Write a protein that binds this ligand. Structure first.
Ligand SMILES: C[As](C)(=O)[O-]
Ligand SMILES: C[As](C)(=O)[O-]
Lengths: 714, 706
């Protein structure tokens, strides 16, 4: 059916000079989220979207089949405080997960906090910190539509609220001191009047200590740096309770400083401060990443990438800090992803080996190997066991494995794994499908690992719809994990799924990351294109039956790839993508990503950014000689109206630009395939209700089945 | 409402089939549809499913209804707890679980744990039918539907560790499991290894069903059916015998203390046990409420349409005394012995509940809590219990489980659990009661729910519900669907308490049954006329809905007054009144309908029988512009309760008479069937109600409001 693309005003005033190169930005006005015109733009694109989505008949069958496939209990990985175990639970279709509590392992669960009983379950919990004595539960809620968090505190004895209320938190955890008196957290300064969380670029993050029973204005300032407003914070406390550790970060880089405060050495408590705090600055530069794993007095075991792309464990005494020793040296082939001190004197290491996990248990003091459990295609994650804990829990998942919380009692039954909880998916035969790993040459010959999931014994004749996922940035490892949606794609649309472990990720250590960032960011798109070409050439699928999907930096990936190779894809779905690479740093926490992208402030970096910036590279493919029959694929640009993480102007400005260049700028365009935006109302980036999510994925796959001309199978 | 033209599928007519009802010839050309398992009947089901799906695709609002119902229903719901030993047991549902989970806890303060989760068995297609916890709280007997039929299989669980006993008891329908105080076993009432010759059995734990002791059966009266009970002191097994659907029963008492050995006393045959037959006729209803030795307190309707409590000693059984005598205006609906020496009575007073606490021995009134527009239900407290629980609900009140500690703080009510519905402002709506004159002048109570301060200008869609039979009281209770109708379709709801029900006792029942069954339809029509004349709605913005006997109500009313309605939705209706008694348990309903076996009864049945009164309204001389309303006939493909031939034969007959029998019919409004396959689960229900209201919004031309 023909589309009626709504009028979007162009402003030819807006020209900007990037080192002599003139760049026109006619949809500058869309950067204002709260204007008459921008709200009418959102309204118009919602109408256009709803008109196209009404023609996608399969949305309703997807939605009902997702709802059924997802209606099973899901369990979070439990953690211990005192004799209490706490975990997240969801019976299957509850809008938000419920936080549960129990006395010891045998104990029966009870509800500690149910977000479904507050504001109808629109917001779930972001922060969830139980104190050392298990008497206090600090928890974070989204008080507005943005993802900014309000810390509140509860007595676990009887669910009664404390008066304490702490605003202006984002990703900070609440780190309790062993005296149960309060906790360290890392807030931003308050909003002055006029300001908004969508329009303010939050800087000058602080390290605070909050005492229980006080107003936030009484919280003790430990650190801040007004001379470096972009520097951001993470923090931690050692398991013995003696050291507060402050990690300072430059941007999105896997690198940090390490500042240690000895809590035993302060006369008059943390009330001592009122003057910044006497940190021992063990690392005062951004050369390498460092994460404390354990300590015995001043003798610290860190995970690091210092002269070690695949990471390693090292030891240092804060009284003799120039002398560092390798405890567990760098592997020659496999990434040390995480390390966790457990069972007093043991050490669990998670290794990533060709995108498959291997768990090692080692002696803490010596570093000697004891056991080694390789794990199947899938992921192991969520190890939250502390050093004093003797039972270790982890979540396992894969493409065909819904989710198993495993349990290892290292003290009393060390070799066995017990299933704490196993989620079973209804109406799904896993043996009918298989998952293979395959390595594919890229444009420069680099072998890129690919996971391909499909029905066993499909003929490779290019008949099948193919859905391909990828990210390619920020050191993120992309693991094959369970999505119920995807099972519905595989089973009821005869689909083939592909997770491509492209460069920019951290799958083969920091060399893999740096091969797809800054000047070499193009390699990431080349890798993804090359993997799409393999699925076609090996015979799973064809040019116009391939669908690509991604979120945030993955949205950038999808937008970049369809600009460069529109012929290769039949559907493009970019979730909250970073589409204006010239101006991303100007909005919210976007300045943090300059470590991976560069910044248009510098001329060298502008020169590589301008070449792939999605909004600046939308070109009519049919106008290229010998490319006449090519058009852009059917495109859905997903975003929320109140995403403060990746601001929606990115998605809006791309959508406006595409709809102009391809459709409304000429009389009768070859562009037939729809170019729409699904804009979710009163949502943020993540943390949305179960049905809000299901509705979005239902629309995704319905649009996809229409674009790829894929029929339903009962 | 519906613009795109329909293609009604061919349905073969058989002019062989003529039947002689006392000289009056009656043709039944869709006789063949009575066979559910034929080539032709299965193709009929397939064709009407195509027609249905084609019409429903045009109903754009179905999807918005479905998502809004799902959201409005996704809140925790709690059932009324009951106590055994120090344990409390209740049904729970987090909101969209396919079936309710049975929970358990140690005392009132205690934290719930799951005792049985049906969602982990058979994917939650079947929930629990029976749920009997033993006296010591160690054993949980529970009923499942093993297959699509309504037959139940009793299974038994140890509550200590969830382990199953080997015991498996087939061939149960509605029977409960009544445990003896020795915890050794239980009385239940199965059918033999059709459904006639029901038996009263005792089952010992750890035995096969074939070893169960026979207490009673009557091969000379195969249609007589059974309920049973045990007294709170554990001493008396009571067997109630029933004639049909009528509110009357016998009362047989067995003294359990007088048996040498246990119930092994009857080990071998000795068919029938030595019951004291306190009532051996079907004159009145009797339900034991309490006893002190052989001195029994019964609820009854003996010379008492609105019911009363009476006392009798089994050693002096000819002497009956009124304990709480019949009220002159209000029905005694149920009575429960509580707190050792107290007695809680539920009265229905102009379709509103009034709870009275009285002294057991004397019958003296102590407290009296009238309750708001709504219902109170599920009082399961025993005599030895000091805390009483009940569930409250209304049109705008999702569900409150109340708690009354009669020992300490007897007058105050605590909220055990209150379900809160999301995205719903209750204060924006109101519910009024109004009494409306019927065709014979009788004042019929009506509940009307709507937005506060609507103008009465006939603009609003109106949905009207009713039943009218079998002594059933129709109470305004919570439906989340209905809130979506009121809020997002600007609707007006009406529950009409028509005759045939029991709302004003047995006089109300008998005024709408047999020869007087027409009064029920007249009452419903009269209430529809009031909503139009008072200005809530108009002729073609009124929708009527009902199930089973309520389906009969809807089909009867649209035949008689098609001009008055814009949408008709009849769920599992009884549509062939000449032949209903021939199928499954349909013979039971002859008490309320009559039977075409007898000539007087045929004469009133033929006048309203839905299948035999489908007439082209436009052919009537004043009535040219009238057509039948948009009609959805709801049914399941293997409903054994109200067999689907009723719905199929009506649908066939309507589609012929109104549409396919003439060149270019004035009948534009669609006449379809929504046939549910193999069915029940939360989503299956939500899908059905989504289709109901989507079709309705299309028929009534009602727009959506955000
Ligand atoms: C939120 As991002 C640009 O690190 O994927
Ligand atoms: C609900 As009925 C007694 O008409 O089957």
């Amino acid at each position: 059916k023909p589309l009626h693309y709504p009028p979007v005003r162009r402003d030819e005033t807006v020209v900007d000079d990037y080192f002599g190169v003139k760049v026109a930005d006619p949809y500058r006005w869309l950067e204002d989220p709260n204007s008459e015109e921008t709200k009418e733009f959102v309204d118009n694109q919602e109408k256009l979207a709803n008109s196209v989505l009404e023609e996608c008949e399969l949305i309703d069958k997807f939605k009902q089949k997702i709802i059924d496939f997802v209606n099973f209990p899901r369990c979070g990985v439990p953690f211990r405080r005192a004799n209490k175990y706490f975990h997240f639970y969801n019976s299957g279709l509850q809008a938000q997960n419920v936080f549960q509590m129990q006395d010891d392992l045998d104990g029966k669960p009870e509800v500690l906090y149910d977000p479904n009983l507050r504001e109808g379950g629109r917001s779930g919990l972001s922060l969830y910190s139980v104190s050392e004595d298990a008497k206090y539960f600090a928890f974070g809620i989204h008080s507005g539509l943005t993802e900014w968090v309000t810390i509140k505190i509860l007595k676990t004895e009887d669910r009664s609220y404390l008066p304490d209320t702490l605003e202006w938190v984002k990703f900070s955890p609440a780190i309790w001191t062993h005296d149960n008196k309060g906790f360290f957290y890392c807030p931003y300064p308050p909003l002055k009047e006029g300001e908004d969380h969508m329009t303010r670029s939050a800087v000058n993050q602080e390290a605070r200590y909050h005492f229980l029973g006080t107003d936030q204005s009484e919280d003790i300032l430990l650190w801040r740096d007004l001379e470096n407003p972009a520097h951001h914070l993470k923090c931690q406390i050692t398991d013995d309770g003696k050291y507060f550790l402050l990690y300072i970060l430059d941007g999105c880089d896997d690198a940090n400083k390490v500042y240690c405060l000895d809590l035993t050495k302060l006369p008059n408590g943390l009330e001592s401060f009122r003057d910044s705090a006497p940190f021992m600055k063990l690392i005062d530069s951004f050369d390498a990443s460092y994460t404390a794993i354990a300590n015995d007095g001043s003798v610290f075991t860190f995970q690091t990438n210092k002269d070690a792309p695949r990471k390693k464990l090292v030891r240092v005494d804060l009284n003799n800090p120039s002398v560092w020793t390798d405890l567990v040296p760098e592997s020659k082939k496999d990434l040390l992803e995480s390390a966790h001190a457990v069972n007093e004197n043991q050490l669990i290491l998670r290794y990533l080996s060709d995108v498959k996990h291997v768990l090692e248990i080692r002696d803490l003091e010596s570093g000697a190997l004891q056991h080694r459990l390789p794990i199947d295609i899938g992921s192991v994650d969520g190890i939250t066991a502390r050093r004093r804990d003797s039972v270790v829990f982890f979540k396992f998942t894969s493409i065909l494995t819904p989710g198993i919380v495993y349990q290892c009692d290292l003290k009393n039954d060390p070799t066995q794994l017990k299933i704490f909880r196993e989620s079973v998916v209804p109406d799904f035969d896993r043996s009918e499908f298989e998952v293979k790993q395959v390595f594919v040459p890229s444009k420069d010959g680099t072998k890129i690992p690919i996971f391909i999931a499909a029905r066993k014994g499909i003929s490779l004749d290019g008949s099948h719809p193919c859905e391909m996922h990828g990210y390619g940035g920020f050191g993120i490892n992309m693991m094959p994990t369970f999505s119920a949606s995807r099972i519905v794609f595989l089973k009821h649309l005869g689909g083939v799924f592909c997770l491509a472990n492209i460069r920019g990720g951290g799958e083969y250590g920091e060399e893999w990351h740096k091969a797809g960032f800054r000047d070499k960011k193009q390699n990431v798109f080349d890798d993804f294109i090359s993997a799409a070409e393999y699925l076609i050439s090996s015979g799973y699928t064809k040019a116009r039956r391939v669908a690509i999907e991604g979120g945030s930096n993955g949205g950038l990936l999808v937008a970049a790839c369809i600009n460069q190779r529109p012929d290769l894809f039949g559907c493009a779905e970019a979730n909250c993508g970073v589409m204006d690479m010239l101006r991303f740093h100007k909005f919210t926490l976007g300045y943090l990503w300059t470590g991976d992208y560069g910044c248009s402030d510098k001329e060298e970096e502008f020169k590589w950014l301008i070449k792939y910036s999605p909004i600046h590279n939308v070109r009519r493919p049919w106008e290229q000689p010998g490319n006449e029959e090519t058009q852009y694929p059917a495109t859905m640009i997903l975003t929320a109206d109140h995403d403060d993480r990746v601001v929606p102007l990115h998605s809006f400005k791309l959508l406006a630009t595409m709809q102009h260049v391809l459709c409304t700028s000429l009389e009768d365009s070859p562009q037939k395939n729809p170019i729409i935006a699904r804009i979710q109302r009163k949502a943020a980036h993540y943390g949305r209700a179960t049905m809000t999510q299901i509705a979005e994925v239902a629309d995704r796959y319905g649009f996809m089945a229409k674009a790829l001309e894929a029929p339903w199978i009962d």
